[PDB]
């Protein structure tokens, strides 16, 4: 199934073949798929998004990981693109991460962007 | 199942009960659900989005309807919020609508917004 993971930044070749796979099925590669969301400007990232959203239930653990992670850009995309499409339980699963991130002291400027994304999403998707 | 449709603009009461329903199951109400996406600033609209995205396959016909529709704001939300999350076949199902909308002559200013949304989405999600 690993052959199903995009091998580079433009690799849309396996998508039609991932669209067939399901929740039980795709989980073994699901975190690798998410790695494509590190930069949304990769032409592949846009193709991957909908797949990882459809299969958001099996992706939750791994979505947490990314938010506890040390990639600023990665969790920024994951927050910006995915939170809005989490179903109530899943959406509630990440509240804590959004909470923590909104909390960080703004040392560098990249930190700012993601504090602000979190305050605003919390503000919008939780009221 | 119709009792499952939000009865007003803030009505989040049936969501947890819709999250249980599936593709075979929910289609009878799916177009009514979409009617909540007419204004995204309705507190309910944000809760509904993820449901109608998860069930995008049964929603396709009805997504077309809205794009051929006469609601500017409605198709604007539907385009802005949903296209980015359509899986390849579904995404290809609406290309024509995006194409047509990008084509409209800009008489009034509200028309502008949706021409521009369509050129830009076409430009981004199709390359």
Automatic annotation (TrEMBL), chains A, B:
InterPro entries registered for this protein in UniProt: Cthe_2751_sf, DUF5071
Domain DUF5071: 4-122
Entries under CDD domains matching the protein: Cthe_2751_like
Protein name stated in the entry: DUF5071 domain-containing protein
Source organism per UniProt: Acetivibrio thermocellus (strain ATCC 27405 / DSM 1237 / JCM 9322 / NBRC 103400 / NCIMB 10682 / NRRL B-4536 / VPI 7372) (Clostridium thermocellum)
């Amino acid at each position: 199934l690993r052959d199903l993971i995009p091998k580079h930044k433009f690799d849309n070749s396996t998508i039609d073949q991932l669209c067939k796979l399901i929740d039980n099925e795709i989980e073994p590669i699901i975190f690798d798929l998410l790695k494509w969301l590190q930069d949304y400007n990769w032409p592949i990232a846009k193709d991957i998004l909908p797949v990882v959203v459809l299969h958001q239930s099996i992706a939750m653990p791994h979505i947490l990981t990314i938010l506890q992670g040390n990639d600023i850009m990665w969790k920024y995309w994951v927050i910006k693109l995915m939170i809005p499409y989490l179903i109530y339980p899943n959406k509630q699963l990440v509240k804590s991460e959004l909470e923590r991130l909104s909390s960080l002291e703004i040392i560098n400027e990249d930190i700012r962007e993601i504090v602000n994304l979190s305050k605003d999403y919390l503000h919008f998707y939780y009221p």
